[PDB]
Design a protein around this motif. Sequence first.
Motif: not given
Lengths: 246, 245
Positions: A67-69, A71, A89, A91, A165, A169, B163-164, B167, B210-211
């Motif tokens: 998913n987008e989270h 690392v 991430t 992104r 979805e 993302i 989640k869609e 988002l 960053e993270t």
Amino acid sequence: MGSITENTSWNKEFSAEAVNGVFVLCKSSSKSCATNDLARASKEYLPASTFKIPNAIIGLETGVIKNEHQVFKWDGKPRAMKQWERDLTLRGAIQVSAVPVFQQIAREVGEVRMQKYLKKFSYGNQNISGGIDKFWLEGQLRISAVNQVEFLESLYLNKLSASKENQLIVKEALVTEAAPEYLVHSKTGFSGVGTESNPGVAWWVGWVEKETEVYFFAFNMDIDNESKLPLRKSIPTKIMESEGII
Amino acid sequence: GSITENTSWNKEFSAEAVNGVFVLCKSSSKSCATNDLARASKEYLPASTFKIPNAIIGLETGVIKNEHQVFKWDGKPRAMKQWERDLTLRGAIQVSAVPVFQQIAREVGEVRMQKYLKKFSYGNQNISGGIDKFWLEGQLRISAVNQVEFLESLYLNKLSASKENQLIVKEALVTEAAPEYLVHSKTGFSGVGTESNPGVAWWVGWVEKETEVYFFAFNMDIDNESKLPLRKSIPTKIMESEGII
Ligand SMILES: *[B@@]1([O])OC2=C(C([O])=O)[C]=[C][C]=C2[C][C]1[N]C(=O)[C][C]1[C][C][C]([N][C][C][N])[C][C]1
Ligand SMILES: *[B@@]1([O])OC2=C(C([O])=O)[C]=[C][C]=C2[C][C]1[N]C(=O)[C][C]1[C][C][C]([N][C][C][N])[C][C]1
Ligand SMILES: [Cl-]
Ligand SMILES: [Cl-]
Ligand SMILES: [Cl-]
Ligand SMILES: [Cl-]
Ligand SMILES: [Cl-]
Ligand SMILES: [Cl-]
Ligand SMILES: [Cl-]
Ligand SMILES: [Cl-]
Ligand SMILES: [Cl-]
Ligand SMILES: [Cl-]
Ligand SMILES: [Cl-]
Ligand SMILES: [Cl-]
């Protein structure tokens, strides 16, 4: 897309900088495109890091990317650029064009699944020969500016062969400028400085949302020196400013 | 979780003679820092910050058909000129187009609205005072800490919605994009308030860098529109001084 027209008045921005390239700008509402050079708009080039857009969608669709989270950890071994030597991430990897991150993703996707999704996406010549983790950098994969705008339109409409979805993302990760009047999604690319008499290619592709309109754009240029890289953004930006889109 | 006071941020408030609070939480809402413990949990009219949950609810109920829906202007006068045009969801959120979200709320209805604010744990969940204005002049109240908790759920896609749809709303909230960090936020402004009872101005959101992620919520007393830019300049100066930028 529905139609395309040549607008040679955009050549002023290219000749002012002595750049050989093309800009394609499509207005979604009218399904009409304009370009400074019809021939080059259809010429196919290495996508380079613009390929991180389909590669990210495919990584998500195949579960390789959770998913987008997620690392993407750095293992501490040297990388080609200092800006890649850190945890990232999705992104962050897209933003700095972290090649090794997406090379690992490609390897896990595999040749068979990668081939399937580029057919589903109608992505360029769909030739991924030359190595699973290098076909978009030094292989035979080629794509035109017109193909790029067509691909990006499908992504914007969530019409690609992937879950909404996962397309959402990747869209969230491509936001590059936010103003009150408009929003820009974009991705840069750079294949290198090329060989003698055979320059590399530099890309800038994306779309602009302004008011109730959507503008899809694709720029590429020949490039033989790293210092010319900013032109891939300044020339399109100046054209879009002249069109009142900013 | 715990809320910790940070006395060093008060300098930014006192230089402008502003009565307000800033809440800032790194990573999560488990540990939040603030200049004023009391005000951090004091509940205020959410004003246009309520367009966040209202947009999520509009999408979850189908009142908002999809992310690309255009809210057409019927041509009749609206209170602000920037509202007199066709608007997308992002466009409506960015100009705080009250009429668009008033109609959304009317279609959602009080029963469904109450249901979702209970699911979101949104403030005191009191939607009394009119379906098209409980967040502007009604009884709904929410605190800076509650806002951060709600924004964290949205960031994690943990709200009671697809989640869609979460988002879609997050994309509509992007307000600054830089190669180093991404900012999602929403402003609020209830008005100049009555005598001895000033209005409230808000700035809430989060920063992805960053993270790491940083959630923030700001509100202030306001009785003169000329003070409005302080709602972004004070929190911006604080987050700049902390190196978040
Ligand atoms: B990718 O094309 O994107 C990219 C960009 C960009 O967005 O334009 C900038 C810098 C690196 C990258 C990675 C991808 N491009 C390459 O891998 C080609 C490679 C990158 C580093 C260059 N180093 C110059 C020599 N000091 C050489 C070409
Ligand atoms: B909403 O709170 O958001 C909003 C903002 C903002 O982003 O804070 C600014 C301007 C209008 C709006 C609409 C929503 N607020 C209201 O409708 C209350 C209204 C706000 C303006 C006030 N008059 C200021 C003079 N120009 C009176 C009350
Ligand atoms: Cl089009
Ligand atoms: Cl060709
Ligand atoms: Cl090429
Ligand atoms: Cl590397
Ligand atoms: Cl917009
Ligand atoms: Cl470089
Ligand atoms: Cl650049
Ligand atoms: Cl902090
Ligand atoms: Cl209040
Ligand atoms: Cl109105
Ligand atoms: Cl105002
Ligand atoms: Cl402001």
